[PDB]
RNA sequence: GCGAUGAUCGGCAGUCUGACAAGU
RNA sequence: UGAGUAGUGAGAAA
């Protein structure tokens, strides 16, 4: 049987009419450094960037990467376990975080992706209606979220 | 459209136990376990076979949330002939009787319902169809009717309840076989009307993952119904 | 008529008693045995102690007992029980009289047309006489009409449409026709019909006929020899 | 537990009867049990109103049997004389029906009351 | 630490012994989970010690409710008593935590377990089903579930035979069958006895009466004054047939038929008497049943007419659901309700409709409303 | 001393044929 | 020998 995946009902051409405040945002592992490195707090750099209440989300795969890092990145590990950061369970064998994040956004058009990886960012860019959050300069920046 | 005296060509559908009636319009149909009657007034197709007159029932996507699902093209349906199925939220025989058609004589349908008044007709329908076992009981406490049900190959939940995830897990934990079938009908308005539909579906998928059900597929049910998706998963005990 | 009517009542009893125990119809198919069970046991609880040996063999009687406890039917009041028993009393009774009428009929044939009963039989002989309306009326008919007596619809349909005519008629159900096979059935029908006429004219028009059926006996013997050589 | 159930309170009954009078003026109201039955058969009824003081109550219990079969909200009011009054008819009314019309000039309050009736159920 | 397991099945109660205890820390490992699915491995874990089938359907329904409500039945108490040693404390695996307190109360010496380890074994026992009793007679579990289930379901629904109206529908579909059928056989009795002396077929047109007189008057020759009185008692002498038959029997052309022929007529006539006798019995039962189920409808129009209307609708629930106009045309083919006459029929149809509503949605219908409702029709009747 | 618990509008249709058949 | 067993729905009376 042939498969033609149905484009999500949350999408009108290129604008997602479903993503709305309070936003749910997936945290990428590299985001934590450029947050710590820039002295930008996770919860509120998001609020300042998006001017809304933001619910950060750490999946098992991104989490699984973090402890593998080791003592050098303990600060990143502890901030990941801040109780304000909710946890997402995963039911796929692989621990590669980039693939897991790309799948979740493919599945449901309700997440913001917080990452600075060029390769991952390009993959998310191809997927329509996925707001992409990044940290540059002094604070966070959101590109595909016109409600801003 | 499909008038009384019209002649149609019946052909099988990709899923076993589901047949397609062709014509100027196409009707997706199921063989009648109890020929000669309609359960909710549905149109019936009769075919002469060597000659016995086998009957078929039309299967309205605007009435059964399952039916709109197959119209949308679900990849995998655990509901198949000669399989045990556990139907939750069996308000009446509108959809159960058709699920009974697919499973056939060899399988059975465990129809679970709570509210007494719709249950009465479910009992009445169960009389014509030997293979349904209606269980007028609140699904939130599967301990009550553990007596009546063994293992089940697939569990279907059409329950419109905000805590519908919990009911599925408890029922699946008891009677669903390892690697069994899970097919859920979700209405976000009943669960959380404050947030948008897509947020709700992601949340429901999450709770299923917490309960050791691996989701396999989900599909939006438009244009037949609003804010509805059917999630298909497999119960992975280990 | 009795055959038709006992069937309809049997259907009603199966449906009505099926409400209190729907599983019986599948297990026991005989209508009379179906009624007797209701008479012996009235309610499924009574099944545990009752013995159905005289009505049913061992394997059948135990299956109904197991069905009784795991049944689907609902409980019924004694008022309901009484009248369904009355039906079951009627159902068994018709069978008793139906057998009686069968024996009464056969005795009637062996005195009024002994020769035909020997050749064609009692039941088929009766339908032949009834179709003509009288023994004399049938006696005056040629053997050709007797061969196709009960196939008028097929006969005249064939005659109008320039197609083959029937060859058995009502005589098809006679034992001798059944013994024949293939095209020999048609030949025996012609031979049997002719001999039936010879015997028939004896029964109807013999003033001092001996109630022995002897002319039927050699007439039967001749057809049997024809069947043997034709089949061989 | 009581056969008449759910029964609207003093506050809730007023808004329901308010919609009833507005519907009557706009010919969107079907009055009487027999009419309400017909609307349920046709599937053109937005929701059904009954009086809890019908004498006897049973003669309108067929609407609840119809209602949730067709997934139509319903509710009971304490008074039939009051219900007939708002209906604009000079006689008591034990049951009435609001006809479906998405082009009606009084759509908004109809859905407002319907939402509350659904919550009560 | 699990040594015994309790499993509840529709036939009875099953108690098991855990021969081997699976790894607890390694419970989530795949192989131990695969062991549950595999029958051969599962057999090495547990073994059946006792099975107590229920005596009958009543016990199963009673125990299912007790099992449903987390209670210990007498049957359940027995099988645990016979199997569990008194004993530090014997460990039992139970699917339900709610049962645990009840078991502990009855048996202080048993500690119940319902942890995941127990659930794994419960899952396996339910998994293999009939295979694990080693041929012990438990029927087939799927069919026992069907019979138990509907009783359990009907129980929580409080479904009552009193509300059953199918008996009425069968009575009507049967009563007319008898009426046509009694006519059919009775006519034939007239023909058979008609030859022996035809004139009685003319004298007593009523077929039901005719069979009795044939049963009494088998031979027309037998004519006595005392017999005249006896047949005079049959029916009444107002018609004078008692004198006519005596006179006309003396003087008739009917050819005597054989004793076997006469034996058939009386026996054949005796059949017509029996069905009509039963038909009267069944007709009475219909009237009794209609008063019970639909006193309002039966009182308002009648027991026979109301039953026919119910059968036409297909069920009393259906009739109450129908609108007044629909009810009127339901019986407009047989004129059940029947310009001024037409008005009454429509008016009567409406009253019958609400009368059905009272009966259908009433746990114990009364006839108080039907009486006044019929009285209301009477006042409407006299007005026109 | 009215009414939504309901005013008003017998036909088709005619009872097959008649000396050959089977074997070396 | 050949040869087919989906009525309408507020008036009515004066
Ligand atoms: Zn993951």
PDB file of N, CA, C and O in Angstrom, chain D residues 14-53:
ATOM      1  N   UNK D  14     -35.020  30.595  34.033  1.00  0.00           N
ATOM      2  CA  UNK D  14     -35.381  31.885  33.455  1.00  0.00           C
ATOM      3  C   UNK D  14     -34.747  32.072  32.082  1.00  0.00           C
ATOM      4  O   UNK D  14     -35.433  32.445  31.123  1.00  0.00           O
ATOM      5  N   UNK D  15     -33.442  31.813  31.963  1.00  0.00           N
ATOM      6  CA  UNK D  15     -32.789  31.986  30.670  1.00  0.00           C
ATOM      7  C   UNK D  15     -33.367  31.024  29.645  1.00  0.00           C
ATOM      8  O   UNK D  15     -33.518  31.374  28.468  1.00  0.00           O
ATOM      9  N   UNK D  16     -33.695  29.804  30.069  1.00  0.00           N
ATOM     10  CA  UNK D  16     -34.299  28.849  29.148  1.00  0.00           C
ATOM     11  C   UNK D  16     -35.640  29.375  28.658  1.00  0.00           C
ATOM     12  O   UNK D  16     -35.912  29.408  27.453  1.00  0.00           O
ATOM     13  N   UNK D  17     -36.497  29.794  29.587  1.00  0.00           N
ATOM     14  CA  UNK D  17     -37.782  30.344  29.186  1.00  0.00           C
ATOM     15  C   UNK D  17     -37.617  31.653  28.411  1.00  0.00           C
ATOM     16  O   UNK D  17     -38.475  31.988  27.583  1.00  0.00           O
ATOM     17  N   UNK D  18     -36.529  32.396  28.646  1.00  0.00           N
ATOM     18  CA  UNK D  18     -36.243  33.584  27.838  1.00  0.00           C
ATOM     19  C   UNK D  18     -36.048  33.207  26.376  1.00  0.00           C
ATOM     20  O   UNK D  18     -36.597  33.850  25.474  1.00  0.00           O
ATOM     21  N   UNK D  19     -35.244  32.172  26.120  1.00  0.00           N
ATOM     22  CA  UNK D  19     -35.034  31.726  24.749  1.00  0.00           C
ATOM     23  C   UNK D  19     -36.347  31.241  24.158  1.00  0.00           C
ATOM     24  O   UNK D  19     -36.612  31.418  22.962  1.00  0.00           O
ATOM     25  N   UNK D  20     -37.196  30.634  24.989  1.00  0.00           N
ATOM     26  CA  UNK D  20     -38.459  30.100  24.497  1.00  0.00           C
ATOM     27  C   UNK D  20     -39.335  31.218  23.945  1.00  0.00           C
ATOM     28  O   UNK D  20     -39.912  31.092  22.858  1.00  0.00           O
ATOM     29  N   UNK D  21     -39.455  32.325  24.680  1.00  0.00           N
ATOM     30  CA  UNK D  21     -40.298  33.418  24.207  1.00  0.00           C
ATOM     31  C   UNK D  21     -39.732  34.040  22.938  1.00  0.00           C
ATOM     32  O   UNK D  21     -40.480  34.362  22.008  1.00  0.00           O
ATOM     33  N   UNK D  22     -38.410  34.217  22.880  1.00  0.00           N
ATOM     34  CA  UNK D  22     -37.797  34.761  21.674  1.00  0.00           C
ATOM     35  C   UNK D  22     -38.003  33.827  20.489  1.00  0.00           C
ATOM     36  O   UNK D  22     -38.266  34.280  19.369  1.00  0.00           O
ATOM     37  N   UNK D  23     -37.884  32.518  20.716  1.00  0.00           N
ATOM     38  CA  UNK D  23     -38.101  31.558  19.640  1.00  0.00           C
ATOM     39  C   UNK D  23     -39.537  31.615  19.132  1.00  0.00           C
ATOM     40  O   UNK D  23     -39.779  31.537  17.921  1.00  0.00           O
ATOM     41  N   UNK D  24     -40.503  31.752  20.041  1.00  0.00           N
ATOM     42  CA  UNK D  24     -41.902  31.802  19.630  1.00  0.00           C
ATOM     43  C   UNK D  24     -42.162  32.991  18.716  1.00  0.00           C
ATOM     44  O   UNK D  24     -42.894  32.878  17.727  1.00  0.00           O
ATOM     45  N   UNK D  25     -41.569  34.142  19.032  1.00  0.00           N
ATOM     46  CA  UNK D  25     -41.769  35.330  18.210  1.00  0.00           C
ATOM     47  C   UNK D  25     -41.219  35.125  16.804  1.00  0.00           C
ATOM     48  O   UNK D  25     -41.768  35.657  15.831  1.00  0.00           O
ATOM     49  N   UNK D  26     -40.140  34.356  16.677  1.00  0.00           N
ATOM     50  CA  UNK D  26     -39.461  34.147  15.405  1.00  0.00           C
ATOM     51  C   UNK D  26     -39.865  32.845  14.722  1.00  0.00           C
ATOM     52  O   UNK D  26     -39.209  32.439  13.757  1.00  0.00           O
ATOM     53  N   UNK D  27     -40.918  32.181  15.199  1.00  0.00           N
ATOM     54  CA  UNK D  27     -41.428  30.963  14.571  1.00  0.00           C
ATOM     55  C   UNK D  27     -40.395  29.841  14.592  1.00  0.00           C
ATOM     56  O   UNK D  27     -40.377  28.985  13.705  1.00  0.00           O
ATOM     57  N   UNK D  28     -39.526  29.837  15.604  1.00  0.00           N
ATOM     58  CA  UNK D  28     -38.503  28.810  15.764  1.00  0.00           C
ATOM     59  C   UNK D  28     -38.818  27.864  16.919  1.00  0.00           C
ATOM     60  O   UNK D  28     -37.944  27.107  17.354  1.00  0.00           O
ATOM     61  N   UNK D  29     -40.050  27.892  17.420  1.00  0.00           N
ATOM     62  CA  UNK D  29     -40.466  27.106  18.571  1.00  0.00           C
ATOM     63  C   UNK D  29     -41.543  26.122  18.140  1.00  0.00           C
ATOM     64  O   UNK D  29     -42.499  26.504  17.458  1.00  0.00           O
ATOM     65  N   UNK D  30     -41.382  24.862  18.535  1.00  0.00           N
ATOM     66  CA  UNK D  30     -42.383  23.825  18.317  1.00  0.00           C
ATOM     67  C   UNK D  30     -42.976  23.460  19.670  1.00  0.00           C
ATOM     68  O   UNK D  30     -42.244  23.076  20.589  1.00  0.00           O
ATOM     69  N   UNK D  31     -44.295  23.576  19.788  1.00  0.00           N
ATOM     70  CA  UNK D  31     -44.985  23.505  21.067  1.00  0.00           C
ATOM     71  C   UNK D  31     -45.785  22.216  21.181  1.00  0.00           C
ATOM     72  O   UNK D  31     -46.551  21.869  20.278  1.00  0.00           O
ATOM     73  N   UNK D  32     -45.626  21.532  22.301  1.00  0.00           N
ATOM     74  CA  UNK D  32     -46.368  20.320  22.578  1.00  0.00           C
ATOM     75  C   UNK D  32     -45.530  19.073  22.371  1.00  0.00           C
ATOM     76  O   UNK D  32     -44.585  19.046  21.576  1.00  0.00           O
ATOM     77  N   UNK D  33     -45.884  18.015  23.103  1.00  0.00           N
ATOM     78  CA  UNK D  33     -45.105  16.784  23.051  1.00  0.00           C
ATOM     79  C   UNK D  33     -45.108  16.186  21.650  1.00  0.00           C
ATOM     80  O   UNK D  33     -44.071  15.715  21.167  1.00  0.00           O
ATOM     81  N   UNK D  34     -46.262  16.192  20.983  1.00  0.00           N
ATOM     82  CA  UNK D  34     -46.350  15.585  19.660  1.00  0.00           C
ATOM     83  C   UNK D  34     -45.425  16.285  18.673  1.00  0.00           C
ATOM     84  O   UNK D  34     -44.732  15.632  17.885  1.00  0.00           O
ATOM     85  N   UNK D  35     -45.394  17.617  18.705  1.00  0.00           N
ATOM     86  CA  UNK D  35     -44.502  18.341  17.806  1.00  0.00           C
ATOM     87  C   UNK D  35     -43.048  18.033  18.123  1.00  0.00           C
ATOM     88  O   UNK D  35     -42.236  17.826  17.214  1.00  0.00           O
ATOM     89  N   UNK D  36     -42.703  17.993  19.412  1.00  0.00           N
ATOM     90  CA  UNK D  36     -41.324  17.728  19.800  1.00  0.00           C
ATOM     91  C   UNK D  36     -40.875  16.361  19.307  1.00  0.00           C
ATOM     92  O   UNK D  36     -39.726  16.191  18.884  1.00  0.00           O
ATOM     93  N   UNK D  37     -41.771  15.375  19.351  1.00  0.00           N
ATOM     94  CA  UNK D  37     -41.442  14.060  18.816  1.00  0.00           C
ATOM     95  C   UNK D  37     -41.090  14.151  17.337  1.00  0.00           C
ATOM     96  O   UNK D  37     -40.087  13.581  16.893  1.00  0.00           O
ATOM     97  N   UNK D  38     -41.890  14.890  16.566  1.00  0.00           N
ATOM     98  CA  UNK D  38     -41.649  14.997  15.132  1.00  0.00           C
ATOM     99  C   UNK D  38     -40.294  15.632  14.849  1.00  0.00           C
ATOM    100  O   UNK D  38     -39.561  15.178  13.964  1.00  0.00           O
ATOM    101  N   UNK D  39     -39.943  16.680  15.595  1.00  0.00           N
ATOM    102  CA  UNK D  39     -38.653  17.327  15.387  1.00  0.00           C
ATOM    103  C   UNK D  39     -37.506  16.364  15.667  1.00  0.00           C
ATOM    104  O   UNK D  39     -36.514  16.338  14.931  1.00  0.00           O
ATOM    105  N   UNK D  40     -37.622  15.564  16.728  1.00  0.00           N
ATOM    106  CA  UNK D  40     -36.572  14.597  17.029  1.00  0.00           C
ATOM    107  C   UNK D  40     -36.460  13.553  15.927  1.00  0.00           C
ATOM    108  O   UNK D  40     -35.355  13.106  15.595  1.00  0.00           O
ATOM    109  N   UNK D  41     -37.591  13.151  15.345  1.00  0.00           N
ATOM    110  CA  UNK D  41     -37.543  12.223  14.221  1.00  0.00           C
ATOM    111  C   UNK D  41     -36.801  12.836  13.040  1.00  0.00           C
ATOM    112  O   UNK D  41     -36.007  12.159  12.378  1.00  0.00           O
ATOM    113  N   UNK D  42     -37.043  14.115  12.764  1.00  0.00           N
ATOM    114  CA  UNK D  42     -36.395  14.798  11.654  1.00  0.00           C
ATOM    115  C   UNK D  42     -34.980  15.259  11.978  1.00  0.00           C
ATOM    116  O   UNK D  42     -34.245  15.633  11.059  1.00  0.00           O
ATOM    117  N   UNK D  43     -34.580  15.237  13.246  1.00  0.00           N
ATOM    118  CA  UNK D  43     -33.263  15.734  13.609  1.00  0.00           C
ATOM    119  C   UNK D  43     -33.084  17.212  13.340  1.00  0.00           C
ATOM    120  O   UNK D  43     -32.031  17.626  12.842  1.00  0.00           O
ATOM    121  N   UNK D  44     -34.096  18.017  13.655  1.00  0.00           N
ATOM    122  CA  UNK D  44     -34.065  19.457  13.445  1.00  0.00           C
ATOM    123  C   UNK D  44     -34.216  20.219  14.763  1.00  0.00           C
ATOM    124  O   UNK D  44     -34.398  21.430  14.758  1.00  0.00           O
ATOM    125  N   UNK D  45     -34.138  19.521  15.892  1.00  0.00           N
ATOM    126  CA  UNK D  45     -34.347  20.119  17.203  1.00  0.00           C
ATOM    127  C   UNK D  45     -32.997  20.427  17.837  1.00  0.00           C
ATOM    128  O   UNK D  45     -32.135  19.546  17.932  1.00  0.00           O
ATOM    129  N   UNK D  46     -32.811  21.681  18.260  1.00  0.00           N
ATOM    130  CA  UNK D  46     -31.574  22.053  18.940  1.00  0.00           C
ATOM    131  C   UNK D  46     -31.524  21.456  20.341  1.00  0.00           C
ATOM    132  O   UNK D  46     -30.538  20.814  20.719  1.00  0.00           O
ATOM    133  N   UNK D  47     -32.579  21.660  21.126  1.00  0.00           N
ATOM    134  CA  UNK D  47     -32.739  20.976  22.401  1.00  0.00           C
ATOM    135  C   UNK D  47     -34.218  20.998  22.753  1.00  0.00           C
ATOM    136  O   UNK D  47     -35.002  21.762  22.186  1.00  0.00           O
ATOM    137  N   UNK D  48     -34.588  20.147  23.702  1.00  0.00           N
ATOM    138  CA  UNK D  48     -35.978  19.908  24.056  1.00  0.00           C
ATOM    139  C   UNK D  48     -36.184  20.364  25.495  1.00  0.00           C
ATOM    140  O   UNK D  48     -35.318  20.157  26.352  1.00  0.00           O
ATOM    141  N   UNK D  49     -37.331  20.988  25.755  1.00  0.00           N
ATOM    142  CA  UNK D  49     -37.713  21.439  27.088  1.00  0.00           C
ATOM    143  C   UNK D  49     -38.946  20.657  27.518  1.00  0.00           C
ATOM    144  O   UNK D  49     -39.859  20.441  26.713  1.00  0.00           O
ATOM    145  N   UNK D  50     -38.963  20.214  28.778  1.00  0.00           N
ATOM    146  CA  UNK D  50     -40.121  19.550  29.357  1.00  0.00           C
ATOM    147  C   UNK D  50     -40.473  20.211  30.681  1.00  0.00           C
ATOM    148  O   UNK D  50     -39.636  20.848  31.324  1.00  0.00           O
ATOM    149  N   UNK D  51     -41.728  20.044  31.082  1.00  0.00           N
ATOM    150  CA  UNK D  51     -42.208  20.498  32.379  1.00  0.00           C
ATOM    151  C   UNK D  51     -42.211  19.325  33.350  1.00  0.00           C
ATOM    152  O   UNK D  51     -42.727  18.250  33.029  1.00  0.00           O
ATOM    153  N   UNK D  52     -41.636  19.534  34.532  1.00  0.00           N
ATOM    154  CA  UNK D  52     -41.537  18.472  35.525  1.00  0.00           C
ATOM    155  C   UNK D  52     -42.840  18.234  36.273  1.00  0.00           C
ATOM    156  O   UNK D  52     -42.945  17.232  36.990  1.00  0.00           O
ATOM    157  N   UNK D  53     -43.825  19.117  36.131  1.00  0.00           N
ATOM    158  CA  UNK D  53     -45.123  18.952  36.767  1.00  0.00           C
ATOM    159  C   UNK D  53     -46.182  18.424  35.811  1.00  0.00           C
ATOM    160  O   UNK D  53     -47.372  18.646  36.044  1.00  0.00           O
TER     161      UNK D  53
END
